[PDB]
Write a protein that binds this ligand. Sequence first.
Ligand SMILES: O=C1c2ccccc2C(=O)c2c(O)c(O)cc(O)c21
Length: 269
Amino acid sequence: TVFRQENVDDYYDTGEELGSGQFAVVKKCREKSTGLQYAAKFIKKRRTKSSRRGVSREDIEREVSILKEIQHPNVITLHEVYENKTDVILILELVAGGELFDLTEEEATEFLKQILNGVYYLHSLQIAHFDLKPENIMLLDRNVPKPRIKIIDFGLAHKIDFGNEFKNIFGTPEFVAPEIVNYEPLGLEADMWSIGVITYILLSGASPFLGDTKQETLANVSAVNYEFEDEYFSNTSALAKDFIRRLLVKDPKKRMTIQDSLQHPWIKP
Ligand SMILES: O=C1c2ccccc2C(=O)c2c(O)c(O)cc(O)c21
C-alpha cells in the first residue's frame, strides 16, 4: 500500500526526540490544523532489495496494517502515515509518561492488569506482539491518579491466523520465549512467556534469565534456568509466584493463555 507523499513538515511541526528503535527515531510533533500532539516515528526504508540496513517494505506494511486494526485504551493508536524516499513516517498517539519501570503487589497488579487487558485485546484479534518488554510498556500520563499503560512498538507483531507462524522473529534475549530462541513455530503463547518475565522483574527488580552475555541469556531461556531468589521474593505472596511459574513454561501448550491469566486467583477480583 502507498501512503501520503506530501511533505510531513507541511502538516506537522516536530519537537523533542522521544526515543528510538533499530532503524527508527520517534519525535514529538504537533499537527498544524488541530494543534493536537502526536509522536512521529520515522522508519528508515531499505535502499535496495538485498540491503541489511533499513526495514523492508513488507515489514513496514505489516506494522502499519496491524496498527490500523487497533483501537483500545491500553494500546497505542495510529493517526496517519506519510512516506518519502527515505522514510515511512507513522503519526502515532503521543504517550508522554515514560516507561513503566522508570513495588507493592497491589501496585504491580494494577499495572499488570492493564497490560493483560491490552494483550487480551490483541490476542482476541489473533495479533501476537512478539516484542513485549518493559521499554515497550509506556505510561500515558504519569501525573494522573491512575496512570494508564499503553503497549507500544508493533514492529515485530504478526497476525496468527493459523495458530502459529514459522518465521525468524527475534526480539531481546532477556524477554523472548524458548520457541523464539530455538527458531520453532511461534504463536500467541510467546507473548504470555514475555508477560511472565515482565512480572518477575516487576516484583523483584531482577531479570530471571539474564546472563553475562547474550548467548548465556538465550541458553538460560531455552533451559528455563531461573529461580525465585529468597532475597528478592521474601514477602512476595505464593500466588504471585504461582502466576509467574505458570507463565514461564517451556512447552507453549502448557503455558497459561491470556484468558487463563485473567482468571488466575492472583489477578481475578
Ligand atoms: O521509543 C519510543 C517512544 C519513546 C518515548 C515515548 C513514546 C515512544 C513511542 O511511542 C514509541 C513507539 O510508539 C514505537 O513504535 C517505537 C518506539 O521506539 C517508541
